[PDB]
């Protein structure tokens, strides 16, 4: 055989609809390797997962496992260049990312199918021998301190690290996962310790026996084998014992507790946690997936339905949680409402009444069998995933499951084990419960404070009298076991291609009532179909009042159909219903077997909807706080939000939405629904297994239902208006300035507006964005260390495009403006002095990126729908533009920069958005920035838009 290969798993059980070939193999140094052959993919990928996470970090240096992760992308032995890895992938249409979990560390990347070997070699140099520079450390420690700083005021990370801190100080579960400058630079210097620690950690835990490699490409299995053996059989083996944690962070002094936590946002979530043993080895039966399916069920007579009718909660989740090798968690989280906050004890009481209901009726074999079929069907008709994320997740689960049963690891279930189900369910008792209640009402009534995040909370102990009530609980009659799933598809027949088949979605129904687009699937051949519907109505966004009544309408509708839709949700038939600036948006995606049944029930309940006052007040209240929760979002998101407000003709801010919300009464909404459904216009897209007559019948069903119940009469052609983008003048600089009231960091967005989305203007922008794509990430973040979040690319809106820069940091926005302007000059100098080859590199890179065909049906449906909502209908856009792209020269880009993006451009449409930090003032080497003209301050948006023209709309094809 082969000396470098220990064993070969030539037979990997794959999906029958999967045409890709798989070959698993175990190397001599104990590296589990899986190879995927896909000769038709446009982008190859590879991923390596080390079984060492941030739980094995030294007690002195916390967040070291995550820190070393960032140090690997900064120069190696064979490739001493600091940004060799990053630059190489960008020049060949690729990307890369990494993340450190509890006991995991994943590194993945995708790239063009031609330069896989060259990229795989550079990736292999990260584990053999990494050079940790003395200055790269001093800069990356700021990058780690900044990526943690952006998560300080985030309720998710605050509650995640709190359940760690409230646990056992001895157990590694309480250790800091992320880590900041204090743990990486400050503390080691205060005790005289760091680069030597990076070397010792990489040489003690980053061993071959704890690594898993998964490579995907166009190459054959033998060529991929000879390449992995070439690069990964040289990895040093040390046989490091896999860190196991048989101990549990929770114990006698950690159970039966009350953690009253004060959140940043105005939310009220209750967290019930059950400490359970590691269920990873029971994957063949998966008792946690069983009990999670019953408890978190949203169907009639479930735990959610009972807690809804009492007017206590809105959502219920659900299932088991992940911890580490040795322990897991079985959580039942639930949101506290007006009455739910006052009846928390009664909510948990009902929970145990449902748990007692499961213990009473005992383990059901027909339920497990139903889960077996649902999972088996979902595995067979499984969508082809994108190479990058696919190899990333497989490499992570390669350590747990055998080589031949990886693709079928989390999908197929074998032998019914009720005793294992009974074992987990036994751990679900009031004697083993951990309650964590979060509310804003606990403001100023807390005693303790978290260390790293500074979270205000108070720890209490639930009285045994309450425990007795939960133990001695009578079975509730409302709690019923879910019946047989009547939405399980039985017909998977793929309808043969018709004689009038079309490569692109065509228009088959153009009337005053509705416009219909139909594209029968001819690429993926599954038994699924995507049904998107866009309802146009003037009374949806005419004023903040109707804007609120429209949102409350669809939220009440989704609330009323929550039970009926969930039964089809488990059967792979989902639906999405959200309101847009033009009206409504319905999107039913899933199996087309019982799909018209779901759609009919949606439309029929949509036309004739009777509002419940109790549910009206609850949703209205939750929507009010949601508009106040927007107050605490990250700066860069506010910059993008404000820019959307500025450039758009009509837009309503959050503050005047809640002001109008205070005038929304129940009788007003009842009279608003028929008025809203009075006149409509439906632009749809039916893309799937259905035929033309089937599509027409579906459209006919929707129209005939709306006409019968809601009396819908068609709109006018001149009544269908699309909003425009504000036309900026030449050499005009505009700045909007507001403050982020929560985060102590500042965000900024610089938008250079270009001209009207034409083939010429499109490729002049995207190619330029391609050239400056990687240098932006390298100069602004890797070299100058402005902030963790550095982004640059094209911005398309209302048929108008341009170049946008998005940076979040703690530095002055005006300083960031200068550094970007200085970046534009040194990049214009770069393009001017590069060879012809250095230009064809970026052309070919963008070309492959644009020609990356969709992976599944929902991906292709998203592209077509985007070309429809933009009302351009340019389905052949990618082919025409790339053809024009390869015919471009460098002189055209220089002219494009001098005319549109130069510091003294004759047509420079530059608008900026400054988002300051909380306590930052308002009034006030390297490449030096040019002198910038005096900008204009935007204080009132109405007076701003009234003083500027409006762009025309892009005419369809």
């Amino acid at each position: 055989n082969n000396p470098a290969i220990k064993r070969i798993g030539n037979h990997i059980t794959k999906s029958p609809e999967d045409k890709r070939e798989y070959r698993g193999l175990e190397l001599a140094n104990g590296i589990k390797v899986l190879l995927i052959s896909d000769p038709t993919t446009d982008k190859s990928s590879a991923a390596l997962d080390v079984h060492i996470g941030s739980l094995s970090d030294p007690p002195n240096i916390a967040g070291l496992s995550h820190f070393l992760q960032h140090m690997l992308f900064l120069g190696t032995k064979k490739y001493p260049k600091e940004n060799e890895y990053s630059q190489f992938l960008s020049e060949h249409a690729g990307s890369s990312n990494a993340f450190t979990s509890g006991e995991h560390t994943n590194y993945y990347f995708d790239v063009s199918h031609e330069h896989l070997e060259g990229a795989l070699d550079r990736f292999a140099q990260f584990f053999l021998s990494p050079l940790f520079d003395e200055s790269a450390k001093d800069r990356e420690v700021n990058a780690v301190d900044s990526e943690h700083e952006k998560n300080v005021m985030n309720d998710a990370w605050r509650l995640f690290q709190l359940e760690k801190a409230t646990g056992n100080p001895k157990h590694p579960f309480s250790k800091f996962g992320t880590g900041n400058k204090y743990t990486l630079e400050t503390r080691p210097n205060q005790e005289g310790i760091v680069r030597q620690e990076l070397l010792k950690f990489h040489s003690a835990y980053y061993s071959s026996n704890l690594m898993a490699v998964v490579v995907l490409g166009r190459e054959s299995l033998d060529d991929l084998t000879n390449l992995v053996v070439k690069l990964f059989s040289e990895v040093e083996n040390k046989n490091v014992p896999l860190p196991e944690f048989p101990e549990h962070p929770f114990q006698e002094e950690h159970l039966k507790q009350l953690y009253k936590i004060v959140p940043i946002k105005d939310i009220r979530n209750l967290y019930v946690t059950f400490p359970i043993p590691d269920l990873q080895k029971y994957y063949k039966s998966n008792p946690g997936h069983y009990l999670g399916h019953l408890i978190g069920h949203e169907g009639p007579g479930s735990l959610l339905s009972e807690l809804k009718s009492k007017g206590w909660v809105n959502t219920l989740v659900g299932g088991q949680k992940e911890g580490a090798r040795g322990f897991m968690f079985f959580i039942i989280n639930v949101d506290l409402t007006e009455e739910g906050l006052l009846h928390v004890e009664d909510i948990i009481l009902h929970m145990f009444q449902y748990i007692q209901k499961l213990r009473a009726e005992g383990p059901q074999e027909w339920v497990f069998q139903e889960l077996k079929d649902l999972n088996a069907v979902a595995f067979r008709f499984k969508d082809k995933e994108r190479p990058r994320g696919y190899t990333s997740k497989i490499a992570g689960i390669l350590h747990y499951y055998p080589l031949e049963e990886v693709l079928t690891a989390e999908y197929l279930l074998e032998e019914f084990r009720p005793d294992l189900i009974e074992m987990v369910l036994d751990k679900l008792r009031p004697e083993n419960v951990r309650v964590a209640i979060v509310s804003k009402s606990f403001e100023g009534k807390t005693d303790r404070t978290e260390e790293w995040y500074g979270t205000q909370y108070k720890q209490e102990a639930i009285p045994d009298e309450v425990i007795k009530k939960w133990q001695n609980a009578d079975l509730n009659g409302k709690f019923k076991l879910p019946t047989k799933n009547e939405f399980i598809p039985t017909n998977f027949e793929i309808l043969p291609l018709e004689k009038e088949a079309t490569p692109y979605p065509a228009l088959i129904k153009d009337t005053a009532m509705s416009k219909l687009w139909f594209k029968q699937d001819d690429k993926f051949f599954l038994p699924k179909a995507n049904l998107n519907f866009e309802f146009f109505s003037p009374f949806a966004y005419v004023d903040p009042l109707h804007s609120n009544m429209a949102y409350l309408y669809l939220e009440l509708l989704k609330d009323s159909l929550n039970e009926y839709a969930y039964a089809a949700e488990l059967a792979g038939l989902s639906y999405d219903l959200q309101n847009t600036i033009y009206g409504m948006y319905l999107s039913v995606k899933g199996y087309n077997d019982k799909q018209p049944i779901l759609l009919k029930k949606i439309i029929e309940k949509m036309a004739t909807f009777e509002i419940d006052e109790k549910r009206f007040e609850i949703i209205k209240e939750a929507y009010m706080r949601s508009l106040n929760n927007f107050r605490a979002e990250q700066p860069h998101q506010h910059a993008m939000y404000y820019l959307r407000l500025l450039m758009t003709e009509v837009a309503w801010t959050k503050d005047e939405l809640k002001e109008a919300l205070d005038d929304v009464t129940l009788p007003r909404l009842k009279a608003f629904i028929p008025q809203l459904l009075s006149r409509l216009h439906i632009e749809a897209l039916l893309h799937g297994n259905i035929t033309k007559q089937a599509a027409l019948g579906i459209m006919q069903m929707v129209e005939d239902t709306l006409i019968e119940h809601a009396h819908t009469k068609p709109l006018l052609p001149s009544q269908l208006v699309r909003y425009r983008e504000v036309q900026l003048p030449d050499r005009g600089w505009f700045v909007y300035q507001q403050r982020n009231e929560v985060h102590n960091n500042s965000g900024i967005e610089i938008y250079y507006q270009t001209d009207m989305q034409s083939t010429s203007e499109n490729m002049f922008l995207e190619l330029f964005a391609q050239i400056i794509s990687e240098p932006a990430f390298n100069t602004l973040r890797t070299k100058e260390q402005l902030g963790y979040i550095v982004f640059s690319g094209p911005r398309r809106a209302n048929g108008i495009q341009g170049l946008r820069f998005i940076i979040q940091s703690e530095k002055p926005p005006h300083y960031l403006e200068s550094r970007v302007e200085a970046f534009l000059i040194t990049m214009e100098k770069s393009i001017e002095d590069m060879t012809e080859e250095a230009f064809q590199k970026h052309i070919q890179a963008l070309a492959i990126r644009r020609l990356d065909k969709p992976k599944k049906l929902s991906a292709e449906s998203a592209k077509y729908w985007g070309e429809i909502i933009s009302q351009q209908y340019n389905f052949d856009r990618d082919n025409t533009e790339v053809a024009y792209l390869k015919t471009l020269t460098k002189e055209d880009i220089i002219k494009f920069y001098k005319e549109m993006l130069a510091v003294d451009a004759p047509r420079r449409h530059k608008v900026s958005v400054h988002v300051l930090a909380r306590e930052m003032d308002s009034n006030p080497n390297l490449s030096q920035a040019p002198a910038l003209p005096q900008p204009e301050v935007i204080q009132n948006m109405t007076e701003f838009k009234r003083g500027l023209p409006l762009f025309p709309l892009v005419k369809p094809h």
């Binding site: 941030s54 995550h66 992760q69 960032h70 992308f73 990312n97 990494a98 993340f99 450190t100 979990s101 990526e147 998710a156 990370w157 995640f160 996962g177 992320t178 997936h289 999670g292 399916h293 978190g296 069920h297 949203e298 989740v317 659900g318 299932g319 088991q320 949680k321 992940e322 959580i331 969930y566 949700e569």
Partner: peptide
């Protein structure tokens, strides 16, 4: 709904 599975990225 059963749970469907924090992560610190680069």
């Amino acid at each position: 709904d059963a749970e469907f599975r924090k992560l610190v990225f680069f």
